[PDB]
Design a protein around this ligand. Structure first.
Ligand SMILES: O=P(O)(O)OC[C@H]1O[C@](O)(COP(=O)(O)O)[C@@H](O)[C@@H]1O
Ligand SMILES: O=P(O)(O)OC[C@H]1O[C@](O)(COP(=O)(O)O)[C@@H](O)[C@@H]1O
Ligand SMILES: O=P(O)(O)OC[C@H]1O[C@](O)(COP(=O)(O)O)[C@@H](O)[C@@H]1O
Ligand SMILES: O=P(O)(O)OC[C@H]1O[C@](O)(COP(=O)(O)O)[C@@H](O)[C@@H]1O
Ligand SMILES: C[C@@H](O)[C@H](N)C(=O)O
Ligand SMILES: C[C@@H](O)[C@H](N)C(=O)O
Ligand SMILES: C[C@@H](O)[C@H](N)C(=O)O
Ligand SMILES: C[C@@H](O)[C@H](N)C(=O)O
Lengths: 410, 410, 410, 410
């Protein structure tokens, strides 16, 4: 509400409570210390959204035993449709030299077979590397998202063409810190989050985020600040590498990542952010992009508890996320793959609707809107009497999102 | 589209054509040289919205002969519902001393009987003067709008309480220029338009706007600049006093006021304006105020040709007007008094729907939306294939406006 | 002091008194009704800075009789060095076809002989017209300023190259209003003042400013607004054509132009202006441009009564004027031609020092600074105890202005 | 140079080299692993400005042996006046209950005797605690700076009155993280740096900044980001606790703190910063505050290599520092205590002039200005031909700084 950024800082208060919604997603690496169906259930309850499998080490048989476990734990909560949370799987290729080695070709092939939701591609140096990965996945894996790991000086120098070729970006700070002067990594990180924010592409901040929590149940002051600063810069997700894989306190690390992220999302200077994104937004005759910027403006003005968006490809939810609302974006979808991929975008809380398609199309749209009202009350994002923004289209199918209603919570 | 106001000026081009819609309303005084049913038809075609009757001079019988003429000319175009334009009548009291003299009490009483749409109240010095006028009008005239003429130093000094008590304001520069130093009038004018803009109340700029056009068919360079500068400041309507009443060129004066106003509406620096109005807009749980700010933001982003708003009391249209969109605001209403009062607010092009109320309420809402698509094509504000913003409510009656759809022109 | 432009308007007050300094210069046309040595004395006291001679009509002998009169009236006040005001002469060519007709060649030649301070060149259509005028003036008139009158659509279309070729610009609204649609003139005027402000070139706003004051001792409301709006746009000088030449009230017109201009200079939104000029100012290693922007920033922060600048070519004073300070700019110079040309730039109050050059150069700089303190007290711009910004160089000669001192008034 | 903060981020480049000047000061704790006269020399060369002694542990005799060592190492470089760097000593009280325990009274008394430059006061909960410390120091220690360590929830809640009572602030994150939820520490840190920036008071960011560098010669990615983020927030100094006291790599830690800080000072968005500080700066008739804001504006416009400021109490240098210039601020002083205290303020590079006071006061001012030109060339902040801003007063003694000259480097 402050007019300067300096006044905004000065007004920050450690007594003012945060909101119940977390906006930043959480990717955890699954290793030895978290592979168990019991430990996984606890991390899904602690707010893990994305289970990452590292194909540096292990056979295909070890990894397929990890994928079974992740899915078993996930489907354990499937009985209550209101409380179910979809969990994505991510494959992280070893990488290199050629863009795709012989090992990677078999791994990527195994990924399509095991039905992963995304691929983190290692050692991306140019757009033609991303085209090589996309070809190997084929037509069977055409709906798999490719996140390019930036890891060297040439990858940084040619960032713009890689971002145009990708589905999103991973600032992989470990390797980036080996191949450039460690004092410069913070600059590369901010440049890349800036540019991904402007394109509307998801950026993941990774590596040595909670490093001291491998051995001790509490982070250092630096680690608390680091996670919070990635969140304030505009990272879409944050990653836990060794902390979840090999350390002694997997759940504590996930719980610490949850707490920091809510707190830092309450320190964002949204008025300057929403403004700056708009003065950069191209005017077009696209209804969907107009409905979305309308919805974000409305939500500020009435301080809505949520933006509800009905989505098949997730595209309509991605566009709202682009404008960085303060309310959580509840995306309702019948497509299980769409619901898992949604975790990459800041703000989107996906909910998977299981109810069958009613004969009357307007009855079917009402069912899904109420479903999303139930989830929001259950999870405590809003209470009966609050105001929500619902976003829908004028006919069935993708690409027709045109309507925006301001409704009282039933 | 420029980032500074200085760059915005520098980019202005005399070769770039204006839009077909005029946003600033036109009030003309009816005198001897414009009282005729033939001259009136020509001024309605030239874009007169409000016919003002000056109760300084003339009997009640002379004035009732003016009102008959205004209405006859108006109803002559009533055969084509698409082309009909509603025309308001305004009563301008003589005024004073007491707030309401004996003459004014009879005049205001005559106004209620003759069914005027608004009253310009002379010599308003304090809020309790506006309360006196409101009492005299009674309950029979409770829906008549009271516009307070500011005309002296005490009226200026106590502006804020008068604006809170009024339905809108008239900067009456003639008398204001007699009672304060003429070099200060420009300051008082800007202060008052600033403050009325911020409250969302209509302000009228009046007196000696096209003074040289009483005798000559062309204005001076100063007069062209004056009308344009009132428009750029944010006046809702402009007034022609002697030029339409007594001069030789009534139609030329109306036609000159039309041309200047379109041109100056294309020089507004809308990005700074819309921004500044929002940072001053109180957050509330009012759906209507959220739907409206959503609609204005959407309309910028898709450069829509029009905002269509369905309105009974006109209230929903007043709220969109508050945010100063660049598109014309087509307000569709079945209430003839609402359609005439709408001329006071910047941007609102009212259209009066005559078609009977269909049994199905959604069919009835569709009828009025198509009606407003027909008027916009006919008048040339948009063509089939263009994008419009339609604004409607979720149930019948006032105060329920909640929906905003981005639609292709049928 | 307000953060928005809307808040700035709303805060304007007709009871808050203006400052004693006028910032906008005044050019008056000398005709039959103002040619007399007695009437001229009265206009110099009323605040005429520039006497313009129209070479449309009259012989060389009639005009040389005007120049004698202007100079006699001027030199009458020369006895008191503190109160003396320098008065420029301007020649306005008839113009056309070729850039310079045969008549113009003789007139321009007569101008160099009679030692005019500037030339208003009529019907400038392209940069090569300004080069033709510059060649005719020769080397004897190389220090004469050429102000290009814009008067047609091609002159407007090619504005940028003319401004690069000129010493300043005159928006000649009369002819510009004949050759383009009168409703567009206000746009051309603002474009040109925008662009001259950004280049740091003087722009004059001319023609039909106080047109009703030819016959009546009081302006219309439109005329009061027009002069004020040119001042608010950023015109450097304003012009009186027929009002001073042929009308009944020459002194009243000059006195009205004085009053309006002080009042409108107190409504400028200086914080946005100074900001926007800086973000457009190229960084360079030029000391003079750094000393000047330093001085304008200092003057805001201490609300100084004046910027004193010692100047030979006037160049140092032109650079301060570029940043549009709120304090008057007292330019002290020993060069009589520099002191007359200074009237073209907004803010500069020139003072001509007559005292002989002291042997010690620092004693000579102190003499001129005290001289400028005396003039400021005498004219009432500041009183003993107030804070002023003094601007000087490190060695004698042009181009060395480097020092900026904040001093108490002695 | 970018117009948004988002564009500014996007333009950041890891190939663009930083400037030679560091702006953020470095405080190192002296413990067992850095107490030696040989190790100290190496840390002074690596860019240690402030040697902090922790009075938690050790006798008075152990500490007085540390103070001797620090001063011996410092005075070893005193032979070359151009290369000498002044080094401050800081006493950090154990603290508590009463504001000052019995131990603290003896320690503070020992501090005055040993002639320390500042005191870090532990467990400050209210303004009256700072008054207690100030009384104990007496009149013998009246020129010692009191930095209040904030360390609990009541210290945070009553921040404003403590800041008004203090000479500066230390965000002590270790203890602050024990007494409030660790996820909130980042918020408290930013609030406090915001508020100290606005008051113009030095803020120190402390504790677990390079924690992994106790055992390993390289920081984690989080630690690189943490130091950089404190610098970007607007911390004046950064602190190394255990890393310099007990760890294996004292010099590597100091060298890493140097590198990160130059790099992060090249990512500041100075245009928004300088703007926001000015719109918050009170207008006053104080010459010094006007000369200072003038100097910072000039330095941006000519991209000066340095601001040279001649200072006795350091006050004139503190005021320039307040506006956060991009150039280093070379403060020239004959007062050794002033030169050591200057390390607390962001940007000030103090230089201690040893040359005797010349008879002619202007010759004496020229001597010190040239001295500061020599140091800047020697250290590589600028080269002959570059432009510098020199700041001086009109007479001898404190409080008279009024002049600002833009000069070529001799
Ligand atoms: O984000 P996407 O993939 O464009 O989906 C948006 C679509 O969702 C809907 O609101 C619902 O349509 P379905 O019932 O076919 O899912 C459509 O009106 C709209 O076009
Ligand atoms: O501007 P008002 O007076 O609130 O009118 C808005 C009303 O118009 C409607 O859209 C149409 O309702 P009606 O059919 O009763 O006119 C309502 O849904 C809405 O509440
Ligand atoms: O504006 P100009 O023509 O550059 O004049 C500025 C000059 O005026 C001075 O301050 C005074 O010099 P003079 O005594 O020679 O006029 C010089 O130091 C400076 O270079
Ligand atoms: O920052 P401080 O303590 O006010 O010192 C500024 C003083 O330094 C000077 O420039 C130099 O004076 P000294 O020669 O007495 O040090 C004075 O003109 C000015 O008043
Ligand atoms: C960001 C947050 O909403 C997360 N993706 C979740 O679904 O819980
Ligand atoms: C402003 C403009 O729309 C006018 N009120 C009209 O109805 O024509
Ligand atoms: C602008 C004002 O200062 C004028 N030029 C004068 O000298 O009086
Ligand atoms: C900040 C930097 O200039 C430091 N104080 C030094 O003197 O080296």
């Amino acid at each position: 509400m402050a007019d300067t950024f300096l006044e905004h800082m000065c007004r920050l208060d450690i007594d003012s409570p945060p909101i119940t919604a977390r906006n930043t997603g959480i990717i955890c690496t699954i290793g030895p210390a978290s592979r168990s169906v019991e430990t996984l259930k606890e991390m899904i309850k602690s707010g893990m959204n994305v289970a990452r499998l590292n194909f540096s080490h292990g056979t295909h048989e070890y990894h397929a035993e990890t994928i079974k476990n992740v899915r078993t734990a996930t489907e354990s909560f499937a009985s209550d449709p209101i409380l179910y949370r979809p969990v994505a799987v991510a494959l992280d290729t070893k990488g290199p030299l050629p863009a795709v080695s012989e090992k990677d070709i078999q791994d990527l092939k195994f990924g399509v077979e095991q039905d992963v939701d995304m691929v983190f591609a290692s050692f991306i140096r140019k757009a033609s590397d991303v085209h090589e990965v996309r070809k190997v996945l084929g037509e069977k894996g055409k709906n798999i998202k490719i996140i390019s790991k930036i890891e060297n000086h040439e990858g940084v120098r040619r960032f713009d063409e890689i971002l145009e070729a990708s589905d999103g970006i991973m600032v992989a700070r470990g390797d980036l810190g080996i191949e450039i002067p460690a004092e410069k990594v913070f600059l590369a990180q901010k440049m890349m989050i800036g540019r991904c924010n402007r394109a509307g592409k998801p950026v993941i901040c990774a590596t040595q985020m909670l490093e001291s929590m491998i051995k001790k149940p509490r982070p250092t002051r630096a680690e608390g600040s680091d996670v919070a600063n990635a969140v304030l810069d505009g990272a879409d997700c944050i990653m836990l590498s060794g902390e979840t894989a090999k350390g002694d306190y997997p759940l504590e690390a996930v719980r610490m990542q949850h707490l920091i992220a809510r707190e830092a999302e309450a320190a964002i200077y949204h008025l300057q952010l929403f403004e700056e994104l708009r003065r950069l937004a191209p005017i077009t005759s696209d209804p969907t992009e107009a409905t979305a910027v309308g919805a974000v403006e409305a939500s500020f003005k009435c301080c809505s508890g949520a933006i509800i968006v009905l989505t098949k490809s997730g595209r309509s939810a991605h566009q709202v996320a682009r404008y960085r609302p303060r309310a959580p974006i509840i995306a309702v979808t019948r497509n299980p793959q769409t619901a898992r991929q949604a975790h990459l975008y800041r703000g989107i809380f996906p909910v998977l609707c299981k109810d069958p398609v009613q004969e009357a199309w307007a009855e079917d749209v009402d069912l899904r809107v109420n479903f999303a009202m139930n989830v929001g009350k259950a999870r405590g994002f809003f209470k009966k009497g609050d105001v929500v923004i619902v976003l829908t289209g004028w006919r069935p199918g993708s690409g027709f999102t045109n309507t925006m209603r301001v409704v009282p919570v039933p």
